[PDB]
Amino acid sequence: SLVMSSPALPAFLLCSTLLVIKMYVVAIITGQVRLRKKAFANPEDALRHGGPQYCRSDPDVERCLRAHRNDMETIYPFLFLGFVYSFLGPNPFVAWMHFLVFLVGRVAHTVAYLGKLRAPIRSVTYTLAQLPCASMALQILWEAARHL
Amino acid sequence: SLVMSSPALPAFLLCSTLLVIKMYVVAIITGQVRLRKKAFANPEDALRHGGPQYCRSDPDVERCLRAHRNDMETIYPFLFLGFVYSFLGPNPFVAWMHFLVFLVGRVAHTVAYLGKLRAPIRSVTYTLAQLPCASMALQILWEAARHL
Amino acid sequence: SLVMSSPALPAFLLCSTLLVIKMYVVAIITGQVRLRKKAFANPEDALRHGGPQYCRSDPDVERCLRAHRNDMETIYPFLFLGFVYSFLGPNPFVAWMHFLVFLVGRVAHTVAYLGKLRAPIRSVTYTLAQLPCASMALQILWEAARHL
Ligand SMILES: Cc1cccc2ccc(N3CCC(C(=O)N[C@H]4CCC[C@H]4CCc4ccccc4C(=O)O)CC3)nc12
Ligand SMILES: Cc1cccc2ccc(N3CCC(C(=O)N[C@H]4CCC[C@H]4CCc4ccccc4C(=O)O)CC3)nc12
Ligand SMILES: Cc1cccc2ccc(N3CCC(C(=O)N[C@H]4CCC[C@H]4CCc4ccccc4C(=O)O)CC3)nc12
Ligand SMILES: CCCCCCCCO[C@@H]1O[C@H](CO)[C@@H](O)[C@H](O)[C@H]1O
Ligand SMILES: CCCCCCCCO[C@@H]1O[C@H](CO)[C@@H](O)[C@H](O)[C@H]1O
Ligand SMILES: CCCCCCCCO[C@@H]1O[C@H](CO)[C@@H](O)[C@H](O)[C@H]1O
Ligand SMILES: N[C@@H](CCC(=O)N[C@@H](CS)C(=O)NCC(=O)O)C(=O)O
Ligand SMILES: N[C@@H](CCC(=O)N[C@@H](CS)C(=O)NCC(=O)O)C(=O)O
Ligand SMILES: N[C@@H](CCC(=O)N[C@@H](CS)C(=O)NCC(=O)O)C(=O)O
Ligand SMILES: CCCCCCO[C@@H]1O[C@H](CO)[C@@H](O)[C@H](O)[C@H]1O
Ligand SMILES: CCCCCCO[C@@H]1O[C@H](CO)[C@@H](O)[C@H](O)[C@H]1O
Ligand SMILES: CCCCCCO[C@@H]1O[C@H](CO)[C@@H](O)[C@H](O)[C@H]1O
């Protein structure tokens, strides 16, 4: 299997795929909140689900969208950085720690966001998860620059 | 050519690249709607295109942005999942079906969204396209986990 | 090192990683603008940073989010297209030009956006940067299609 192309790759692929699934969970939750709060973005949706008055914004729907947007701002860069980093021959344990900190930090971020936990819990989880991303980015920079 | 690194890879790369182009089409349409409806997001844009009163929201512009956002929520994960999945040695025909269902579902989604088609047409196309994504995600999970 | 898998790959990885860092800069700027303008998206944030009246929109915060969103609309596709393109055996210099035009155009885009530069400066930088993306997309299309 090509999953064993580098020692760090299986761990990366596991964490990444779980994070993609975690984004899908946010999408599904968003839909549930739209239905339960009767807050649809489109008149065609509203007309099917009770009437035109239900084409409206809702604070919980907006919160769901913010969490999903923040995921796109952070998880997508990780999918790139972590993949490249997996092939730079990092220490297996060190690589695992990078991926695990990102995974745990991001899951915690969604819990803190959707759960409306007191500040600065969400902001701390965000910061924590970005640390391994910064680390991988710098490592890629050095490796790429030195091969020019 | 490195396109033949796995039997499924050419089909993946074709479908993916078409989907990226399809997102670019949404970006271009968005610009056209801004110009034709005179609805700009920035005062500097509005001042060039008729005056400060044209820095305003518009329902069709907002709809375009929703379609584009939904694309980012779904197509970007597919770019990751489909790439990895291509290297897991799936059945060539089965892989093609995964990619084709996503491609057709997503093109249909944009048509249903921008075309303001009756519900639940858009929601059904969304659901259809997510099915192969869920399938690939699970397959990657098993392969990654078993190589830990 | 696997960075030398293709002659164009180091240049791609350098430009890409710089662009990811450039997105991170936008995220950090956004946070700074929220703090300095006292404009928070969440009541829990506002209550920590002065009171509930600070859960409010702000034009500069919205501008930051637009720049970040536009980055997600363009840089993420480049991460995909440029990676694949690096393995299609393009002319080293031609590939560098594709990556450099995207890098320079996108950095200029953020400067023009956050700097509120007169139109059509931002729109021109956007257009310029999309040109190598269109070029790479077409090249991938031909290579993928011919290997079907
Ligand atoms: C993210 C994801 C991953 C994997 C599989 C997924 C499978 C589905 C999936 N959805 C994400 C939330 C969506 C959701 O709950 N939308 C609701 C809010 C506005 C409209 C309403 C749709 C109702 C509906 C849906 C489908 C068919 C008919 C109807 C109807 O109107 O009868 C549904 C699709 N995500 C998935
Ligand atoms: C997505 C994509 C892929 C490949 C190539 C692309 C090439 C271009 C491209 N655009 C996406 C829609 C944008 C658009 O229509 N914007 C208009 C709405 C607000 C401002 C206005 C801009 C007008 C303008 C543009 C360029 C130069 C001068 C002016 C002017 O003001 O004279 C233009 C760039 N996307 C592309
Ligand atoms: C993008 C990125 C890359 C690499 C490393 C990064 C490291 C951090 C990082 N931030 C992106 C801007 C965020 C920011 O400035 N947020 C402020 C606006 C609303 C709330 C406020 C948070 C204040 C805060 C933050 C952390 C801990 C405690 C508190 C507090 O309340 O005491 C902070 C996290 N991005 C990074
Ligand atoms: C990956 C998806 C994670 C979903 C985490 C949802 C956390 C829900 O948490 C809930 O939040 C409510 C406020 O929204 C509170 O009223 C409840 O006390 C709390 O249980
Ligand atoms: C990939 C890009 C797909 C673009 C699909 C655009 C579909 C346009 O479809 C149009 O939508 C209008 C409402 O918006 C209707 O008034 C028209 O009847 C319909 O033809
Ligand atoms: C990658 C991040 C690039 C940040 C570029 C920020 C450009 C700031 O530029 C500033 O913009 C202000 C308006 O916003 C103007 O008042 C100032 O004259 C100008 O210096
Ligand atoms: N787009 C972000 C940029 C900065 C950021 O990511 N901040 C973190 C920590 S405060 C966050 O959780 N932001 C909430 C959000 O993006 O909605 C924002 O508007 O806040
Ligand atoms: N961000 C989405 C999450 C759920 C989703 O993707 N729903 C599908 C099927 S209803 C959709 O087409 N949503 C419209 C949109 O994202 O604007 C939303 O707000 O609806
Ligand atoms: N989502 C974009 C689609 C078109 C686009 O990307 N336009 C360029 C050139 S005008 C841009 O800089 N848009 C500003 C933005 O996306 O906020 C929009 O709403 O304008
Ligand atoms: C936001 C600040 C986080 C910094 C992450 C540290 O990242 C570290 O940078 C070093 C020097 O470039 C590298 O040698 C090291 O491999 C890397 O883990
Ligand atoms: C949203 C529900 C869609 C489920 C997609 C099914 O996905 C399937 O899962 C099986 C069991 O894990 C795998 O053996 C199989 O390869 C995969 O195609
Ligand atoms: C938006 C218009 C930009 C077009 C980019 C041109 O792209 C070019 O297309 C040719 C024909 O397909 C290819 O032979 C060539 O390799 C490619 O650079």
Side-chain angles (χ1 to χ4, degrees):
Chain A
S1 181
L2 295 166
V3 181
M4 274 179 77
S5 292
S6 68
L9 191 64
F12 167 71
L13 293 176
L14 184 85
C15 292
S16 289
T17 305
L18 289 170
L19 287 158
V20 171
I21 293 163
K22 188 228 68 70
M23 290 183 72
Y24 291 165
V25 172
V26 173
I28 291 159
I29 290 169
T30 304
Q32 290 299 300
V33 179
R34 290 192 177 283
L35 287 163
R36 293 178 210 194
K37 302 290 291 294
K38 306 186 82 62
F40 307 99
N42 305 296
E44 65 272 25
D45 300 347
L47 289 170
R48 174 166 170 85
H49 298 280
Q53 68 269 38
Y54 301 116
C55 188
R56 62 187 179 171
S57 65
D58 173 272
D60 295 319
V61 176
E62 290 169 345
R63 179 176 290 270
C64 288
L65 289 162
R66 289 197 293 280
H68 206 166
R69 175 185 44 64
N70 193 278
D71 285 358
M72 298 197 283
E73 292 170 3
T74 54
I75 296 170
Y76 298 161
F78 175 84
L79 297 178
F80 179 76
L81 296 170
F83 183 76
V84 176
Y85 170 76
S86 291
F87 291 99
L88 305 183
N91 178 265
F93 180 79
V94 173
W96 279 43
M97 293 302 92
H98 278 76
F99 308 148
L100 188 56
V101 167
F102 191 73
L103 173 67
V104 171
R106 290 312 304 184
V107 172
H109 185 272
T110 303
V111 173
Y113 217 160
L114 302 185
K116 310 176 188 179
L117 298 186
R118 69 180 188 279
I121 295 167
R122 189 198 73 253
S123 300
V124 169
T125 67
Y126 181 93
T127 302
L128 173 66
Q130 289 310 96
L131 298 176
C133 295
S135 174
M136 293 184 296
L138 292 174
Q139 291 177 69
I140 297 162
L141 279 188
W142 313 147
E143 286 307 313
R146 82 185 196 81
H147 285 88
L148 294 172
Chain B
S1 181
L2 295 166
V3 181
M4 274 179 77
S5 292
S6 68
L9 191 64
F12 167 71
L13 293 176
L14 184 85
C15 292
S16 289
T17 305
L18 289 170
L19 287 158
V20 171
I21 293 163
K22 188 228 68 70
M23 290 183 72
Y24 291 165
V25 172
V26 173
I28 291 159
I29 290 169
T30 304
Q32 290 299 300
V33 179
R34 290 192 177 283
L35 287 163
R36 293 178 210 194
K37 302 290 291 294
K38 306 186 82 62
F40 307 99
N42 305 296
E44 65 272 25
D45 300 347
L47 289 170
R48 174 166 170 85
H49 298 280
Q53 68 269 38
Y54 301 116
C55 188
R56 62 187 179 171
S57 65
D58 173 272
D60 295 319
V61 176
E62 290 169 345
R63 179 176 290 270
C64 288
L65 289 162
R66 289 197 293 280
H68 206 166
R69 175 185 44 64
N70 193 278
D71 285 358
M72 298 197 283
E73 292 170 3
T74 54
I75 296 170
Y76 298 161
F78 175 84
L79 297 178
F80 179 76
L81 296 170
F83 183 76
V84 176
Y85 170 76
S86 291
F87 291 99
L88 305 183
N91 178 265
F93 180 79
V94 173
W96 279 43
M97 293 302 92
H98 278 76
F99 308 148
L100 188 56
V101 167
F102 191 73
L103 173 67
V104 171
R106 290 312 304 184
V107 172
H109 185 272
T110 303
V111 173
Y113 217 160
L114 302 185
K116 310 176 188 179
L117 298 186
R118 69 180 188 279
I121 295 167
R122 189 198 73 253
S123 300
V124 169
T125 67
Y126 181 93
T127 302
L128 173 66
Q130 289 310 96
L131 298 176
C133 295
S135 174
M136 293 184 296
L138 292 174
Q139 291 177 69
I140 297 162
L141 279 188
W142 313 147
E143 286 307 313
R146 82 185 196 81
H147 285 88
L148 294 172
Chain C
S1 181
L2 295 166
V3 181
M4 274 179 77
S5 292
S6 68
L9 191 64
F12 167 71
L13 293 176
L14 184 85
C15 292
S16 289
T17 305
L18 289 170
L19 287 158
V20 171
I21 293 163
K22 188 228 68 70
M23 290 183 72
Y24 291 165
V25 172
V26 173
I28 291 159
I29 290 169
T30 304
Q32 290 299 300
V33 179
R34 290 192 177 283
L35 287 163
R36 293 178 210 194
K37 302 290 291 294
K38 306 186 82 62
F40 307 99
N42 305 296
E44 65 272 25
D45 300 347
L47 289 170
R48 174 166 170 85
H49 298 280
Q53 68 269 38
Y54 301 116
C55 188
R56 62 187 179 171
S57 65
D58 173 272
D60 295 319
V61 176
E62 290 169 345
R63 179 176 290 270
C64 288
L65 289 162
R66 289 197 293 280
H68 206 166
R69 175 185 44 64
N70 193 278
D71 285 358
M72 298 197 283
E73 292 170 3
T74 54
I75 296 170
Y76 298 161
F78 175 84
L79 297 178
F80 179 76
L81 296 170
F83 183 76
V84 176
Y85 170 76
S86 291
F87 291 99
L88 305 183
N91 178 265
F93 180 79
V94 173
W96 279 43
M97 293 302 92
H98 278 76
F99 308 148
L100 188 56
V101 167
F102 191 73
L103 173 67
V104 171
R106 290 312 304 184
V107 172
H109 185 272
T110 303
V111 173
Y113 217 160
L114 302 185
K116 310 176 188 179
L117 298 186
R118 69 180 188 279
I121 295 167
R122 189 198 73 253
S123 300
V124 169
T125 67
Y126 181 93
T127 302
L128 173 66
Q130 289 310 96
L131 298 176
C133 295
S135 174
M136 293 184 296
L138 292 174
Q139 291 177 69
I140 297 162
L141 279 188
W142 313 147
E143 286 307 313
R146 82 185 196 81
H147 285 88
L148 294 172

